Each structure stands twice: as C-alpha cells, then as structure tokens.
C-alpha cells in the first residue's frame, strides 16, 4: 500500500525508533517499548549503516526476522560490518551487513566452528 513497513527498531534516544524495510529510521515515531515482531538495533552507528542491515532484514526470511531480541553493531579489524543479533533462547549469533540475510537465512543451522580461533 502506502509507506515502507517497519522491519526493525533502533534503540535510542531512549526510545525505540521503527525503522522501515528501506532503513527509513523514524526517530519521530519512536515508542516505550520494544517490538518482539521484529528485532531491535541497539547502539547502532549512522542509518547509512542502519540502512545497509535493514536491507538484508528486507529481504531476509520474516522468520528469521521475528525471532531475534537486539542487534548490535560490533564491527572488527576484519569485519567493520560485524553485526549481533540476539536470540529469544538467549543465544548470541554475529553475522555480518553484508550476508546478515544469509546468515540468518540459514537459520535454523548456524554456528560453525569458525569462532573458536577468534576469542
């Protein structure tokens, strides 16, 4: 219809701002509450980066995209654009903006033994 569909909420301000499938973050609509539909961005840089993981949430599968509790931007020496979203069980799984979408496609079936040699 009219107006993008809100995929995601930034936590800020004190607040949790809807951000649109394009990454159109209203920091003007912003509520007291966080939307368990979809994940939450905590502490998340500039939207132009906000931007980059909403378009994978965009296309990424809503299943995926209703299961999650807070996605938080941790880049790293290899991976500016290393993101971690939370999960309902209390699980922790860090996927990157560029396949954020793919990574949490293959959900349920990630974690790998690929983090073993970075902690």
Same mark, same amino acid.
């Given at each position: 219809?009219? &107006?993008?569909?809100?995929?995601? +909420?930034? @936590?800020?301000?004190? !607040?949790?701002?809807?951000? =649109?499938?394009?990454?159109? %973050? %209203? ?5 007291? !509450? ?6 939450? =961005? #905590? ?7 906000? /931007? *980059? ?5 965009? *296309? =990424?599968? /809503?299943? #995926? =995209?209703? $299961?999650?509790? &807070?996605?938080? +931007?941790?880049? !790293?020496? &290899? @991976? &500016?654009?290393? #993101?971690?979203? +939370?999960?309902?069980?209390? @699980?922790?799984?860090?996927? !990157? ?6 990574? %949490?496609?293959? @959900?349920? /079936?990630? /974690? $790998?033994? %690929? ?5």
């Amino acid at each position: 219809g009219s &107006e993008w569909r809100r995929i995601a +909420y930034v @936590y800020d301000r004190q !607040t949790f701002f809807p951000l =649109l499938e394009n990454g159109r %973050l %209203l920091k003007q609509e912003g509520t007291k !509450t966080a939307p368990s539909d979809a994940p939450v =961005l #905590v502490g998340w840089k500039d939207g132009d980066a906000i /931007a *980059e993981m909403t378009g994978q949430l965009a *296309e =990424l599968p /809503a299943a #995926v =995209l209703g $299961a999650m509790s &807070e996605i938080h +931007y941790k880049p !790293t020496r &290899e @991976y &500016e654009d290393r #993101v971690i979203v +939370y999960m309902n069980d209390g @699980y922790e799984v860090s996927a !990157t903006i560029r396949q954020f979408a793919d990574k %949490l496609s293959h @959900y349920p /079936a990630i /974690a $790998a033994a %690929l983090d073993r040699n970075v902690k």
